[PDB]
Amino acid sequence: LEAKKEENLADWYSQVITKSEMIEYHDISGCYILRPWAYAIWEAIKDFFDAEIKKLGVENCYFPMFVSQSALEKEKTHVADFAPEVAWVTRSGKTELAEPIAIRPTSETVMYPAYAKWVQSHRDLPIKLNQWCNVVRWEFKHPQPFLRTREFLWQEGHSAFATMEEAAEEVLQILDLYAQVYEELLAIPVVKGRKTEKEKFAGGDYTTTIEAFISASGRAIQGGTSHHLGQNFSKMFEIVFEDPKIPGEKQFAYQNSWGLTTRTIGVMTMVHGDNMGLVLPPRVACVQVVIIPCGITNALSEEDKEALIAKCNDYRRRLLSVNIRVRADLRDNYSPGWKFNHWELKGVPIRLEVGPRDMKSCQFVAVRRDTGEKLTVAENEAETKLQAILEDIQVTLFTRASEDLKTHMVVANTMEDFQKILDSGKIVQIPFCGEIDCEDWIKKTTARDQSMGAKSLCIPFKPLCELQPGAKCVCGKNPAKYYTLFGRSY
Amino acid sequence: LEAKKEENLADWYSQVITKSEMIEYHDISGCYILRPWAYAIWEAIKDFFDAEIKKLGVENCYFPMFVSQSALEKEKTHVADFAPEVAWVTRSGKTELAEPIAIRPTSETVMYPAYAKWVQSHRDLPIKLNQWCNVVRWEFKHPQPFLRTREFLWQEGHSAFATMEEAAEEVLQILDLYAQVYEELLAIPVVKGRKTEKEKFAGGDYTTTIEAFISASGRAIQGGTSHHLGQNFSKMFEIVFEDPKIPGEKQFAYQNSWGLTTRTIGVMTMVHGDNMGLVLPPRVACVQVVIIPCGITNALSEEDKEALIAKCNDYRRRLLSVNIRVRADLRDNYSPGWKFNHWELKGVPIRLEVGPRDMKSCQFVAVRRDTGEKLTVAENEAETKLQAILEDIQVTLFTRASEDLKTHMVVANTMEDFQKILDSGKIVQIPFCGEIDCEDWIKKTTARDQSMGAKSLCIPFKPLCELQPGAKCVCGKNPAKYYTLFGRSY
Ligand SMILES: Nc1ncnc2c1ncn2[C@@H]1O[C@H](CO)[C@@H](O)[C@H]1O
Ligand SMILES: Nc1ncnc2c1ncn2[C@@H]1O[C@H](CO)[C@@H](O)[C@H]1O
Ligand code: PRO
Ligand code: PRO
Ligand SMILES: [Zn+2]
Ligand SMILES: [Zn+2]
């Protein structure tokens, strides 16, 4: 690895995601190839998330990519926000078609007409559907793999309930899943909160969110969102039903929508990556343990070259037996030192070294990718020891990133202190009146004092400090409603 | 179900796929919503296929949807065939962009440049990648759900080998998987063969294929294809390497590509569907066994209504224990007779009836969806009996469709007999010279004698009859090369 994370981070990132074989550049801007090492992490995330929503009654399905201009517009507020980023199909071959059709940037307006068709009684609610698919949002701002791409993969869940309590409860369940994905799987700590009025989802009443902190570039980033759409879409799309116990009067369904994307893998890379390359939390790596024959003195023995391979495979088969995702790298075209480096660049949690000298003592070497720490392990304790190290690595990664968060998110009560803290490369919980104007102000202001301006991240469900009765927002003007998390951002 | 399969098949199909809740129509033509009951079958197919290719060394990945005009064209023969059906993105919002970009109709020309970048040594082969995704092929011909849609889901595998023997071997392995998917999972019999020179994949040397027979409309359909691309793409895209043991000379990789789509579910519906609705092979149904409380005489007992529910759930939990995908339909808003019909329309293999009278005798009723046959089963033999019936249903479906095939595919040696057989609503193995001209002739000719013309399906790897030395193609002109399967087709 050439660049250093601490110097040219954009160079460091572009190298780590290519030399770990995660990404490959396309000939169309802001479009990126997910090579298997990357796609496997997504599949791990998908495997977790999918089994969870299934438990909540959600079912998978698949809706068309194309949305007609009529349907796209039915919720004027929603379509306003997405309209410029929407790509439009115009011709098939040479035939310009009888209409411009839109590629989904999101699927509210593809799915919701059909929700109307499907809801005819109170019996037909709830409706809970999720789909894994690609969407397109065409922004010309300079793109970055995973973090900011023109096409990307995600899931989107869309639910519809008779009541609002039901819908309410789903929003927070989903956001807890998303929090788990970040914290249990990717070993990344997040802050759960509510988006501000400025920031919330176009259409719908409230947006909850989880935010993570990329200490390297000092910015924070949004990991996943869970929206309460209320009746906003319900009324534009005619998703209606007769309440049985309040007859004659028509009802509108309450609606949620929620999403998580491949940006997860980018956040994973930025938080955990080394000057030595990628590092993978055991819960998501394609391979957790790589077995490497080493100490082979070129031209020595062929009966021994065979006993060595046999030992490597004894290990693999035993690790497979206790559900460790293990690969034995037995290739003879590459040096042991080359293999050591290859799998380090790729971030495999544990490198397992088998050499003749070690075999003689009926034993081997386990090497942790996070700390670089070597441990000699007895051959008969191989399963239990490697389990324990993997899970210790999962823990270590998360606590390191935890403590990193805890010292880069601090409360600052005045616009003076909030500007110095924000410039030290941090994120801050300020007292905030909650107004759209005041928020637009802080953005311009913080970009003037000391090269972008801070944004609202979220209003933390569990904020650092209890906001005191006599408390002014950092604009002076209005008093403060709630401690609100602010910082520079992706 | 209104229509009859034997009368208005297009009406019968449009009803069966909507009233079974598989499909929902979109406001854009030839675009269809896969509701969960449908999407679950795909997921079953995906689960099978995926584990198999994994065993062959294939890995999953994801390439962009968009392909640039430069890359699209690099293989002139390939792009020629797909060019008119390709949809083109032209504007983002109001901004017409600096180029028209193409939506993938297939991914050879998205993936192959990157294959060149990735192959630098003989060490870098083989390269075996698969992706599950959507493609778009915009044809205005009147579309049909699953069978002929403008957007659809599929997998595509693309491999690259040093040698040709390797590539050769993969083509036939994949086609065997595809055959299994049709025969083991969907209970549909297929004929494996090689496509003719007219029909083969644009670009590349040979196309192998599996063909299935939809007796209702008398036509056949293509279920999956496995192509040998040879060096055709290799040379257009610079996918090259130095052969080590033949130094100085540059080599081109041999390439395969292969695909299977959601048309599977349409073939499944057309082959197995009833006048009573859909019917699902146990290997793929969302639910295999539906448990229904019935015989409930409205207003009778509430202690008994409770003992009944308890019994339904005893069954469910026991069936879950032996991996039977079971759902207990306990809803009180709907009649037992309504539930009976609902799940029949949806094609659930076994309906499990629990009534008070039956509970008294420590027993229940299992009802087969294919035959409609009722069996009273002891409560203690519930797991073993339901296993046996499910697998008997899988067998019954397949043998019925087998015998249906065997009597609708027959050999016919002369253009006289081939035209009468083809008009009885069948498919025929004729002696055939193999020429593109002669093939274009049969098409026009068979549409004149007796409202479409027969096409080549495939040249059966294991044809009905051994072609005799003195044998003329059905054009009179040239002698016959090989028995070739012909018929009317989707
Ligand atoms: N450019 C992007 N690349 C990947 N995910 C994105 C991108 N932009 C927004 N998202 C995701 O969009 C979802 C809601 O807009 C959020 O969860 C956010 O993570
Ligand atoms: N219209 C379609 N809908 C679904 N699959 C299709 C369609 N047309 C072609 N295919 C599939 O395309 C693959 C190769 O072209 C074949 O396996 C065929 O099954
Ligand atoms: O874009 C969003 O935030 C929501 C998530 C699901 C679909 N729309
Ligand atoms: O269209 C086809 O037939 C092949 C299958 C994989 C991609 N292209
Ligand atoms: Zn303020
Ligand atoms: Zn001929």
From Swiss-Prot, chains A, B:
It comes from Homo sapiens. It comes from the Eukaryota. Homodimer. Part of the aminoacyl-tRNA synthetase multienzyme complex, also know as multisynthetase complex (MSC), that is composed of the tRNA ligases for Arg (RARS1), Asp (DARS1), Gln (QARS1), Ile (IARS1), Leu (LARS1), Lys (KARS1), Met (MARS1) the bifunctional ligase for Glu and Pro (EPRS1) and the auxiliary subunits AIMP1/p43, AIMP2/p38 and EEF1E1/p18. Forms a linear complex that contains MARS1, EEF1E1, EPRS1 and AIMP2 that is at the core of the multisubunit complex. Interacts with TARS3. Interacts with DUS2L. Component of the GAIT complex which is composed of EPRS1, RPL13A and GAPDH. It is found in: Cytoplasm, Cytosol; Membrane. In the N-terminal section; belongs to the class-I aminoacyl-tRNA synthetase family. Glutamate--tRNA ligase type 2 subfamily. Zn(2+) binds at C433, C438, C473, C475. Transmembrane segments: none annotated. Changing F82W: No effect on prolyl-tRNA ligase activity. Decreases inhibition by halofuginone. ATP binds at R137, E139, R148, T149, Q222, T225, T261, R263. L-proline binds at T106, S107, E108, R137, H227. This is Bifunctional glutamate/proline--tRNA ligase. The modification N6-acetyllysine is found at K481. Multifunctional protein which primarily functions within the aminoacyl-tRNA synthetase multienzyme complex, also known as multisynthetase complex. Within the complex it catalyzes the attachment of both L-glutamate and L-proline to their cognate tRNAs in a two-step reaction where the amino acid is first activated by ATP to form a covalent intermediate with AMP. Subsequently, the activated amino acid is transferred to the acceptor end of the cognate tRNA to form L-glutamyl-tRNA(Glu) and L-prolyl-tRNA(Pro). The lineage of its organism: Eukaryota, Metazoa, Chordata, Craniata, Vertebrata. Mg(2+) binds at Q222. Changing P100R: In HLD15; slightly decreased protein level; does not affect multisynthetase complex assembly. The chain holds residues 1016 to 1512 of 1512 of the full protein. It is linked to Leukodystrophy, hypomyelinating, 15: An autosomal recessive disorder characterized by hypomyelinating leukodystrophy with thinning of the corpus callosum. Clinical features include motor and cognitive impairment appearing in the first or second decade of life, dystonia, ataxia, spasticity, and dysphagia. Most patients develop severe optic atrophy, and some have hearing loss. Residues 1-490 are annotated as: Proline--tRNA ligase. The modification Omega-N-methylarginine is found at R137. The modification Phosphoserine is found at S335. The WHEP-TRS domains are involved in RNA binding.
